[PDB]
Design a protein around this ligand. Structure first.
Ligand SMILES: Nc1ncnc2c1ncn2[C@@H]1O[C@H](COP(=O)(O)OP(=O)(O)OP(=O)(O)O)[C@@H](O)[C@H]1O
Ligand SMILES: [Mg+2]
Lengths: 250, 327, 310
DNA sequence: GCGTAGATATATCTACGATACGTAGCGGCC
DNA sequence: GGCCGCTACGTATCGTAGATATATCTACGC
């Protein structure tokens, strides 16, 4: 949750995690810790504002250890970065690490490139975390270019239209707008297909793509943050030698 | 390489006590802690009120079929029975029995039964024995607190016929000097030595200037009775006491046969003992009304009466009345 | 024996993974620190703090559990006679959601560990009530030691002087009960070791040193632990792991726990594919990122520099 | 017959959060 | 290089909702 105030509200995060996790059928009567949390007539648990946040956290710990999920997914995890103290980023990450600790539940965080603010902010979090890069499709490497071409061909074959449009010619245009991102391309094609169905046109004309494309100002801001994060997330053999040299392993 | 392979499996230690295993103070001595004082001490050690701890843990084991959480928000009288209450909880009553059983199960301790008189159930009559209102010796509390010693209430203070502390020769005080009210033994929060109502202090240098010799026999006999129970090592047998009383009666009869004048001094006690030996033996005997005067006229301490075997008791009785018998 | 039980090959993959995960090896640093810690535990010698540092993954948690279990079994012959006699108590500190470290949570969690009844209700006979309850519980239950894992989270306070006031509160807890407090944490612990005379006298410092690549003896020890991990890897064929000792050290920094978890990842990947040997690319798939290794190396180098005071 | 307990209303204490103000550190100008 | 003004933040304070101590009426068990 992006918070209205300048601080991330951990109480809201804890109560939302509890309400989301606790949605099975009513037969489970777990009897969580703390007096302020219980079920109701309709089956949706209720938490009073009187309950302090750490007690809610402890109840969440008990619920997590009892249920024992395989992974705890958190989307747009970069919202944890909304604080006022500079060092508070480490505090937020330490709170999340501590949480996952005694619960023993692997916490998976998915977010934009600004999530990189918590990448290797400390050694304890650096070891206890592995990173997966959801790389987009570039242009210098012909391999990802061919992959993008194949994706475009599959999309144009799967378009519910009488005539299958040639999307292979303007692959440069689609890459310039969609920036290779498969989701952005899918949304663009969705808009264009909706317009075509409104006009009942058996095809997708170029100008139709320009109608529901993205402004160059938007696309420029996209690539501005994409290239900035990629160099941070780039590992080269040069970074290996000094690591070997610093350890004395060279 | 290294052949050492550690194993971090748990060890499964035996189950721990639900409540702290607080030792009872001065067990086997005339200054044993009362069960009420022990309850308040256990509550203080847990940073809980006696009431709150009671419905937290003792009530579910005592009150068998109720909602424990719904029991957590009641008054102490719902399970203790404050309609009776009184320092008589330290006696041999049914709620005392179940409370002692539950306490002994909770802490797996084996001495709480000595902090009351259930070991004398069926032996000593309940009526006319315990005070209705809480009592204390202010000198005892002041000395204990000044000496950094644990505050508590001895069993002797709970008896009507114990009004003086032999250590300080001070008459027991039943009224709080601050609020002017008389404390019940059981309350929501009544730590030992404190006024259960006004939270005022009850320990002061009060001087006792009465004829303590009149009640000395009673207080010493009751003190011996309390101090002797843990030392027996068994649950007393009613007919053991009945037949010891009968033996004392026979010694009295032989002494009267030898000396006629002793009938004047012992006729009433002779009749009382004969009645007590003709009524049902399982019926308890009035402690201060019957046993203490009987052993007093027999010139025998309560400790000697309840502790020595039949041979020693008979020999000492014969020597005391200068009889020529030998059992 | 140097080899794993041979019937484990016929058993399913889960059984092999379990045998590997509950298996732990005793390298010289771990056993030396274990002997030192238990010698200090048996004879506190008037010291109320047994601060233990170490890199992230040297085996601090494993040593903590081993010491707890061994002290538990040492005390076991006499717990039948004496009840309310919990041998050892070990809890982990919680990083605070707020800016400052929370002590009410610490006290209530310690009470939960001791199986205190009616923790929430409580009362104050005079968070003072929770602190008094913890003091009384420590006095009566009589624990031999008190481990506090992740002690770096204690100093989550914006006040530099309150950094040692956290240990002041812990120390005030300790004195009125006389219970040994052996805190465990990362190198962010030295910011608490010997501040003020009270924490400089009654604190004994144990350093869980890692295996550095400079001393040939430590290199030989690392090669030996690699060899024993290879010989204890539950596979149809034993892969040769000692050869890539440089590669194994590069992504582990000498931390034995890092090697253990990396080998667990590789073994699970092999078992999921029903493979019979470990390839170099198999290790490369689940190796730690170069930036991550650089960061932890920087942290442990700073910690070693700070602890290098003589 | 009288203590004695149980129910309930009520203000008052208390814990917690919101807020305005004091201050000190830091950026700007002579 | 020194002094002044701004403003960001800690913190004392005060409001407010909930727990609770208690007084009082009435019934009942001793
Ligand atoms: N000597 C060892 N042999 C085998 N496995 C080990 C060893 N030391 C650590 N491990 C493994 O490491 C994990 C425990 O974490 P470890 O103690 O290494 O981390 P730590 O960073 O020191 O502790 P923490 O992060 O809790 O402060 C377990 O998976 C355990 O099997
Ligand atoms: Mg660990």
């Amino acid at each position: 949750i992006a918070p209205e105030s300048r601080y991330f509200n951990w109480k809201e995060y804890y109560t939302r995690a509890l309400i989301t996790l606790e949605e099975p059928l009513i037969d489970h009567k777990f009897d969580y810790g703390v007096r302020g949390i219980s079920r109701d007539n309709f089956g949706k648990i209720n938490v009073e504002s009187k309950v302090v946040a750490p007690a809610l956290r402890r109840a969440l710990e008990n619920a997590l250890i009892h249920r024992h999920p395989d992974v705890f997914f958190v989307d747009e995890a970069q919202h944890f970065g909304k604080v006022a103290s500079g060092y508070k980023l480490q505090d937020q990450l330490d709170c999340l690490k501590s949480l996952a600790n005694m619960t023993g539940i692997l916490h998976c965080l998915l977010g934009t490139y600004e999530l990189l603010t918590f990448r290797n902010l400390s050694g304890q979090l650096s070891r206890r975390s592995v990173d997966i890069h959801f790389r987009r499709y570039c242009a210098d490497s012909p391999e990802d270019v061919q992959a993008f071409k194949s994706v475009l061909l599959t999309f144009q074959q799967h378009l519910p239209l009488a005539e299958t449009p040639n999307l292979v010619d303007h692959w440069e245009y689609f890459y310039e707008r969609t920036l290779g991102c498969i989701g952005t391309l899918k949304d663009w094609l969705k808009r264009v297909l909706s317009d075509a169905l409104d006009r009942e046109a058996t095809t997708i004309t170029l100008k139709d793509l320009q109608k529901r494309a993205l402004s160059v100002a938007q696309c420029q801001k996209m690539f501005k943050e994409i290239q900035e994060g990629e160099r941070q997330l780039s590992e080269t053999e040069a970074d290996v030698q000094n690591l070997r040299s610093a350890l004395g392993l060279g | 390489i290294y052949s050492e392979h550690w194993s971090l499996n748990p060890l499964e230690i035996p189950q721990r006590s639900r409540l702290f295993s607080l030792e009872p103070v001065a067990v086997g001595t005339p200054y044993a802690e009362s069960l009420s004082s022990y309850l308040h001490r256990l509550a203080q050690a847990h940073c809980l009120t006696s009431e709150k701890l009671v419905m937290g843990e003792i009530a579910p084991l005592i009150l068998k079929d109720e909602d424990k959480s719904e029991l957590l928000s009641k008054n102490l009288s719902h399970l203790l029975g404050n309609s009776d209450a009184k320092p008589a909880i330290n006696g041999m009553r049914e709620m005392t029995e179940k409370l002692v059983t539950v306490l002994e199960e909770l802490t797996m301790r084996q001495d709480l039964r000595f902090l009351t008189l259930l070991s004398w159930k069926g032996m000593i009559y309940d009526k006319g024995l315990f005070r209705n209102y809480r009592a204390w010796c202010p000198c005892c509390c002041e000395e204990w607190m000044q000496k950094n010693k644990t505050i508590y209430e001895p069993l002797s203070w709970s008896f009507k016929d114990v009004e003086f502390c032999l250590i300080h020769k001070q008459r027991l005080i039943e009224e709080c000097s601050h609020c002017g009210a008389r404390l019940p033994v059981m309350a929501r929060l009544s730590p030992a030595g404190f006024c259960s109502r006004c939270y005022g202090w009850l320990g002061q240098e009060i001087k006792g200037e009465e004829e303590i010799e009149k009640y000395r026999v009673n207080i010493q006999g009751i003190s011996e009775l309390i101090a002797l129970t843990p030392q027996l090592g068994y649950k007393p047998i009613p007919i053991e006491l009945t037949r010891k009383l009968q033996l004392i009666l026979l010694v009295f009869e032989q002494a009267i046969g030898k000396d006629v004048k002793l009938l004047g001094d012992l006729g009433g006690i002779m009749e009382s003992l004969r009645i007590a030996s003709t009524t049902n033996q399982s019926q308890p005997y009035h402690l201060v009304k019957l046993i203490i005067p009987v052993c007093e006229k027999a010139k025998i301490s309560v400790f000697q009466l309840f502790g020595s075997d039949f041979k020693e008791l008979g020999k000492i009785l014969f020597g005391n009345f200068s009889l020529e018998l030998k059992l | 024996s140097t080899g794993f039980p041979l019937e484990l090959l016929t058993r399913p993959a889960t059984e092999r993974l379990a045998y590997f995960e509950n298996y732990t090896v005793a390298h010289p640093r771990l056993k030396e620190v274990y002997e030192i810690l238990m010698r200090t535990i048996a004879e506190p010698a008037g010291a109320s703090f047994i601060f233990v540092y170490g890199a992230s993954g040297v085996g601090k948690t494993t040593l903590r559990l081993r010491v707890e279990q061994k002290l538990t079994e040492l005390a076991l012959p006499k717990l039948e006679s004496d009840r309310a006699r919990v041998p050892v108590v070990g809890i982990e500190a919680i990083a605070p959601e707020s800016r400052y470290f929370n002590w009410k949570e610490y006290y209530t969690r310690a009470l939960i560990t001791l199986e205190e009844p009616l923790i929430d209700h409580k009362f104050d006979y005079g968070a003072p009530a929770l602190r008094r309850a913890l003091e009384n519980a420590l006095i009566h239950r009589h624990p031999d030691v008190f481990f506090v894992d992740e002690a770096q989270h204690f100093g989550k306070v914006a006040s530099g002087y309150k950094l040692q006031d956290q240990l002041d509160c812990l120390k005030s807890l300790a004195n009125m009960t006389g219970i040994l407090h052996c805190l465990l944490g990362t190198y962010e612990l030295l910011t608490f070791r010997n501040l003020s005379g009270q924490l400089s006298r009654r604190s004994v410092d144990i350093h869980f040193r890692r295996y550095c690549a400079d001393s040939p003896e430590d290199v030989q020890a690392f090669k030996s632990v690699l060899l024993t991990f290879q010989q204890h890897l539950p596979l149809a064929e034993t892969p040769n792991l000692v050869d890539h000792w440089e590669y194994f050290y590069e992504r582990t920094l000498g931390c034995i726990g890092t090697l253990k978890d990396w080998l667990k990842r590789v073994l699970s990947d092999a078992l999921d594919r029903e493979a019979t040997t470990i390839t170099l690319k198999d290790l490369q798939k689940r190796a730690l990122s170069v930036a991550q290794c650089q960061k932890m190396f920087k942290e442990i180098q700073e910690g070693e520099r700070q602890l290098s005071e003589t």
